[PDB]
Ligand binder design. Structure first.
Ligand SMILES: Nc1ncnc2c1ncn2[C@@H]1O[C@H](COP(=O)(O)OP(=O)(O)OP(=O)(O)O)[C@@H](O)[C@H]1O
Ligand SMILES: Nc1ncnc2c1ncn2[C@@H]1O[C@H](COP(=O)(O)OP(=O)(O)OP(=O)(O)O)[C@@H](O)[C@H]1O
Ligand SMILES: Nc1ncnc2c1ncn2[C@@H]1O[C@H](COP(=O)(O)OP(=O)(O)OP(=O)(O)O)[C@@H](O)[C@H]1O
Lengths: 422, 423
């Protein structure tokens, strides 16, 4: 089942159950200036959940474009499950149904619409949420040995210091004994064997300025399921980067690098980064040294640095815009409309960074050759930031590849000294 | 080697190196209203480290009484071999004097030369962005590099606060051997009692200002801390802190009061831990109450009493453990001996007060657990036991933990908001 088929099947399943199918919001949130990028299907409905905005539907469903880079940027290429850019499939209840319907909707979709066998699924609840435990174990009657009760850090949510909060229940997919890791709640739960597929958030209480808890007047539901993780389940593959919607991207990156080794991790990094960078440019973000524009700059330049690692000879990053648009333009026409703008923007940024990347890498490679210890010193980090346009995390990501770190504190001291020279 | 011998040797080792040996401060901190109880040897020297207070010594050493029951290790007592509410922290301090090289050499010398601990039983970690500390350990001291880990800022970077001094830390661990569960620092099961953190060295190296800018600290400083009970267990060949010499008379007396012969029973160890924090807190001026420091004391007292109930003790018992505590540690802490009768009176009265509702409250709890479907004691039971029977939520939750149950905190909080409205 292709990713587009799964996205549509998800949305059709909830439309049939009376959910208003709504479009994704932009990656640049409007109703939330403090937030860098849209990181969940929840964001555009935040004011509805708060009761500050009225809409004429009390149940919705979306496929939401999200970026988590300000944070999953350092997991890209190192795990089978993390992206900067991903799509979150969500259903929402605005004071309509609550735990019982949300749980059955999700279990029905996974085990009946999608046909996933219950023996491959694992469920967690908040260890203080007896309603969700009772619904799962006594009503749905799931296998209790593939079940865990988890503390507040993973299974309790709050919109902020004030406002709605409540327990969460989560559904995981067991990729089997060939992948390293243990079930949720075990010491190696972080492994890629048991992948979190679907997160169900139950908005159940209100916390006020003084810290008091009260019942939420209209208990609400917000869920989110990563499209790529469920696509990997439905296509029988272990890694997100093996699904249909990444193949053209990885194949094109490979073609530009002149290699047939489709297992090279820099290809996956480049494939991930073009998705976040292209979609961000199409939502209006432009490279700069501040705010949202610097996050984009940081991600572009890191993709370029990985092309350097692969030995790519000519400006390349902008060339992945077209296969992305061909692959996702049906679902995201704003990509097709802005294709030319996105290509120009990415090309210019790569050309601008190329005037210092080669020299900066020579300094980096020389430093790695002569270094004693495992820490790149702060003055070198600052030299690369200040003269050669290397963001600190770009330098740190290169250092990671040679079992090295970078002196963040030493870099910060260099920055204060520079303010002192001004 | 007894705990008192280790305490004295530690202080004498640093006194020879020109450290002024200073007394422990109180568990109730001065010039620091935000902090609940003194929780580290640093607390009394904080203003010296900040340059706000002048003293006529630039290096010191103390054995500091500490309590960690807030802001917090109360829920680890009895469940790990290594955690207390009350413990003594052995520290040496440099006030802009020596720095990383001497601190590391002082620490290694004391463990491997004074105390004779084999290097094959020690494990060292550094901040993974601290090349100076790595170089000193690996190139100068020349420790075995396979018993060494480079750890990120969560475990090995320290800061006094959002502004003020900060810097990297290096830590020394002891390997209790293959019969204990756990892995080395940095491994997935680094938690667990096999590799126990013995000594923490804090290097005050930078200053962070209001806006988050770092500058070099004008006079780099050192603050260290090593738990007396953990090193005593190493030096006495035992796995659990509670098996060391300084806990034996306490656990033995508690066992006699409970009529049991199992000197390792975990509720005995909890009772032995709690009398140390409760007695020393009362001796430092704290009194049971429903607010602030007095409520933390009340909570620890009542949890000890509830554990006596679990062991079947029928007659008020908790205050009877002050006398063996004072006998065991009175040489080191004479204020305990002077305040002994007052401590016993306060602890006795508090138990008699809780006893007016403890039995009835437990019947409600035991009946609730017998008929309970699910794993969560509901919020209205939690609020009833709190509001009518004086059961702190963590007391009720600690009972529930023993039956693999949890407690509805959110539901309890909702009940509390409703009660405030009835006012
Ligand atoms: N960076 C990412 N890359 C790929 N998929 C992701 C990423 N972040 C989240 N997902 C997917 O989206 C789903 C919903 O994410 P969401 O943030 O709501 O859950 P979560 O991270 O468990 O939340 P919480 O941290 O509040 O417990 C996840 O279950 C996962 O399938
Ligand atoms: N056609 C392909 N052949 C090989 N690797 C690919 C291909 N397409 C993508 N990759 C990426 O290369 C990564 C590493 O593959 P590797 O050969 O090291 O392990 P593998 O046998 O594919 O195991 P797994 O499927 O669990 O990753 C994969 O996880 C995947 O993201
Ligand atoms: N609750 C406790 N019970 C017994 N010993 C303790 C307790 N807390 C700390 N110690 C001992 O005191 C030493 C110093 O404590 P300290 O808090 O400085 O180290 P830490 O816990 O690593 O702190 P940080 O994580 O802030 O660096 C520890 O190495 C440990 O041996």
């Amino acid at each position: 089942m292709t990713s587009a088929e799964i996205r549509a099947a998800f949305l059709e399943f909830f439309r049939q159950r009376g959910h208003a199918v709504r479009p994704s919001s932009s990656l640049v949130p409007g109703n939330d200036p403090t937030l860098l990028f849209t990181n969940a299907g929840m964001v555009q409905f935040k004011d509805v959940f708060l009761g500050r905005e009225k809409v004429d539907f009390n149940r919705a469903a979306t496929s939401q474009r999200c970026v988590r880079a300000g944070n999953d940027l350092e997991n890209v290429g190192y795990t089978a499950r993390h992206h900067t850019f991903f799509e979150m499939l969500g259903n929402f209840s605005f004071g309509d149904y609550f735990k019982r319907d949300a749980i059955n909707f999700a279990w029905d979709f996974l085990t009946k619409e999608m046909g996933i066998p219950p023996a491959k699924l694992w469920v967690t609840v908040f260890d203080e949420d007896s309603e969700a435990e009772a619904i799962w174990l006594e009503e749905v009657k799931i296998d209790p040995t593939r079940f865990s009760r988890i503390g507040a850090k993973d299974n309790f949510w709050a919109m902020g210091d004030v406002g709605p909060c409540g327990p969460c229940t989560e559904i995981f997919y067991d990729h089997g004994e060939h992948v390293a890791g243990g079930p949720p709640g075990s010491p190696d739960e972080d492994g890629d064997r048991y992948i979190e597929i679907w997160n169900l958030v139950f908005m159940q209480y209100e916390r006020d300025k003084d810290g008091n808890l009260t019942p939420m007047p209209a208990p609400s539901v917000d869920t989110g399921m990563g499209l790529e993780r469920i696509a990997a389940v439905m296509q029988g593959v272990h890694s997100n980067y093996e699904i249909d919607i990444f193949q053209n991207l990885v194949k094109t990156a490979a073609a530009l690098a002149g290699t047939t080794d489709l297992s090279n991790s820099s290809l996956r990094v480049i494939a991930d980064h073009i998705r976040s960078c292209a979609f961000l440019v199409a939502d209006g973000v432009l490279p700069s040294n501040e705010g949202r524009g610097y996050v984009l700059r940081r991600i572009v330049r890191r993709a370029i640095r990985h092309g350097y690692r692969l030995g790519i000879q000519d400006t390349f990053f902008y060339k992945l815009v077209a296969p992305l648009a061909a692959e996702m333009g049906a679902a995201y026409p704003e990509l097709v409309k802005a294709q030319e703008q996105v290509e120009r923007v990415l090309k210019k940024e790569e050309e601008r960074f190329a005037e210092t990347l080669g020299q900066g890498m020579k300094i980096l490679e020389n430093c790695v050759a002569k270094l004693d210890g495992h820490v790149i010193p702060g003055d070198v980090v600052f030299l690369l930031y200040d003269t050669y346009g290397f963001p600190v995390d770009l330098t740190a990501d290169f250092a990671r590849e040679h079992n090295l770190s970078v002196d963040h504190a030493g870099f910060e001291v260099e920055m204060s000294a520079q303010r002192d020279r001004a």
